[PDB]
Design a protein around this ligand. Structure first.
Ligand code: L2C
Ligand code: L2C
Ligand code: L2C
Ligand code: L2C
Ligand code: TBA
Ligand code: F09
Ligand code: F09
Ligand code: F09
Ligand code: F09
Ligand code: HP6
Ligand code: HP6
Ligand code: HP6
Ligand code: HP6
Ligand code: CO
Ligand code: K
Ligand code: K
Ligand code: K
Ligand code: K
Ligand code: K
Ligand code: K
Lengths: 106, 103, 103, 103, 103, 106
């Protein structure tokens, strides 16, 4: 199965700063990576699909970039409601797999 | 009207249906096989087009028994249908040449 | 003159135009997609030739929706045009055999 | 009955036999070549199908002299046979158009 | 004898010559390009066969301008020649059906 | 030739525990990996074919997973008769090759 590594596991940042979450795939997967936000006690919520595509309802703050094996979720100007766990997910090859998670800390 | 053009029209509709059903069935066949890439619908439709035209880039291909049977039906239908267009064109040209000759 | 040869000539000119416009539009469609290789004009012309003839080595291929629509037009036009040449040859051979028979 | 349909039927049976013998002989030819992937029977049958239809994804291919000779026979037979179907369809359409004209 | 069979024979000889000259010229064109794999004669002959039949596995392909022009000539000649065989078969079937009808 | 690495060479486990044997191929081989059990003084016995397929007569205890380069033989709830050497084997490319073996210890 495709291994998705997310390191660092925790990310500390000051309010209004730009933050970047990393996702690395164990093999090349074009742009078939999707990003989810999960707040404390909430269900996951899709933020970005196919590595860079916006979802409606998601703040413009959030963007994605990357292809092949290296992927980045970015937040321009972090704020409090962004405190969450962040997961990447691949749909290039069966079975779909998740990364292990990066926690965002302010 | 003329049989060759009826058959061409019919060939084209059938091929469109084979592409669409092939996409749906390839995903069905291929999910559950570790390593399979032919597993979402939009790229499956692309894959079936490039298989029917017999272009086959190698960006996508089935790895299961049923996926591969699906693939074969798609090939045979693309080759057959395009062959039928060529046949219909040859009938058209032959009939017009008989005329131009006065036969 | 004869319809089959007119159509062959016309098929060949159309195909050349499809290759050229396909190259230009594939680059247009594909730039802005991370990972896309089909992004400079000279290799795009090569890519469209190997797609029209349906050879498809897999050294190059579109990854976007529009790039892939472009690809489909190129395939259909290469297959169609070469089919039309075969049709025109069959008309030629059939007419000459009618003669050789005295018909 | 009619020659074109007899030949089509015969083409199809021959092609099935070429696929099967090609699979068996490709494995025979290719085992003993370090790096060869064309070495088990089920994927060899798949490989020969995708070669006969000339789809050629590139997931499998021979690397030895005899494997490649085997491959050539399979190509020629798939192209030839499918060509023969197109020919038979053109004969069918031409005969029906002669009728519809009263000739 | 009959034009269609003469042309088929002639098509086959021409194609053999194009394969052989294409192999020789592809190596010539491609050596001196860093990364090129199409650089020894035996695999070049194989490469040209899989290009003429339009199978194109993707194990080998030209990367230079002239190598790619060479490739195009080979494609056009393989497609054309095999098309000519189909044409000749359609002439054969059509003539035999005229007979079987008493025409 | 394809190199098949099996590490650890020995695996110690307590009865009824879940155990996982590892097999790594030096290049990508889809799912063309088969697993054999060899007890002391016995001949090898096929357990799993094509990475995850059951053989009849093998206890349901045994399963396989993986594709590409990373393969796992698993045993739910180990028991005494599972004390053996365990080998993986590849049939993707000529010649067929074996891994070096993992011994199971209870
Ligand atoms: C069995 C049901 C089949 C349904 C398939 C429908 C797909 C078509 C449009 C949907 C829009 C979309 O979001 O896909 C484009 C995608 C953008 O992310 O990129 C893609 O590459 C899609 C490739 C599809 C190419 C098909 C070309 C065939 C002429
Ligand atoms: C829409 C506009 C299309 C314009 C394309 C024109 C390219 C042709 C000649 C330019 C010379 C050049 O510098 O290219 C060769 C290049 C050398 O660096 O190597 C290449 O590989 C170019 C490959 C092109 C192969 C095309 C074969 C088709 C019969
Ligand atoms: C010269 C003798 C040829 C014998 C070949 C017979 C193979 C067919 C069925 C056997 C079932 C099996 O276990 O194969 C399917 C396999 C499942 O492991 O996955 C496969 O991918 C097999 C691929 C075969 C695809 C062929 C499609 C052609 C229409
Ligand atoms: C322009 C001159 C062309 C000359 C080419 C002649 C090659 C043919 C035989 C020589 C024997 C040899 O040592 O090649 C086989 C090789 C064994 O090392 O393996 C190979 O893979 C050679 C592949 C050639 C496949 C061609 C199949 C076409 C029907
Ligand atoms: C330019 C396209 C020609 C490709 N054909 C037919 C197209 C199939 C949609 C492949 C048929 C082979 C089964 C002709 C063979 C070319 C040698
Ligand atoms: C031979 C083509 C028919 C499709 C075979 C089964 C479809 C997928 C089953 O899961
Ligand atoms: C269907 C072929 C027409 C081309 C589609 C759009 C061209 C590229 C747009 O950016
Ligand atoms: C030319 C096709 C006939 C097959 C050549 C030999 C078969 C494999 C020998 O080991
Ligand atoms: C267009 C085909 C003719 C070949 C072009 C030149 C051959 C290689 C030159 O080095
Ligand atoms: C079981 C019906 C077959 C579907 C057509 C395959 C494309
Ligand atoms: C919008 C016009 C289509 C261009 C032809 C595609 C090759
Ligand atoms: C020696 C007989 C040739 C077998 C047919 C090749 C497919
Ligand atoms: C300059 C002569 C062209 C050779 C034929 C290409 C295969
Ligand atoms: Co008459
Ligand atoms: K390839
Ligand atoms: K490749
Ligand atoms: K082809
Ligand atoms: K092809
Ligand atoms: K191909
Ligand atoms: K390919």
């Amino acid at each position: 199965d495709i291994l998705l590594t997310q390191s660092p596991a925790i990310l500390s940042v000051s309010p209004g700063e730009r933050v970047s979450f990393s996702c690395r795939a164990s093999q090349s997967i074009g742009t078939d990576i999707h990003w989810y936000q999960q707040r404390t006690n909430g269900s996951p919520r899709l933020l970005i699909k196919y590595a860079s595509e916006s979802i409606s309802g998601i703040p413009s703050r959030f963007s994605g970039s990357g292809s092949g094996t290296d992927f980045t979720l970015s937040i321009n100007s972090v704020e409090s409601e962004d405190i969450a766990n962040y997961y990447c997910q691949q749909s290039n090859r069966w079975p779909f797999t998740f990364g292990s998670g990066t926690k965002l800390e302010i | 009207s003329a049989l060759h053009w009826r058959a061409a029209g019919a060939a084209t509709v059938l091929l469109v249906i084979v592409l669409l059903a092939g996409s749906y069935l390839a995903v069905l066949a291929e999910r559950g096989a570790p390593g399979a890439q032919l597993i979402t619908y939009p790229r499956a439709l692309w894959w079936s087009v490039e298989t029917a035209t017999t272009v086959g880039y190698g960006d996508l291909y089935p790895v299961t028994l049923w996926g591969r049977c699906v693939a074969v039906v798609v090939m045979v239908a693309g080759i057959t249908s395009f062959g039928l267009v060529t046949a219909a064109l040859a009938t058209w040209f032959v009939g017009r040449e008989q005329e131009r000759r006065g036969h």
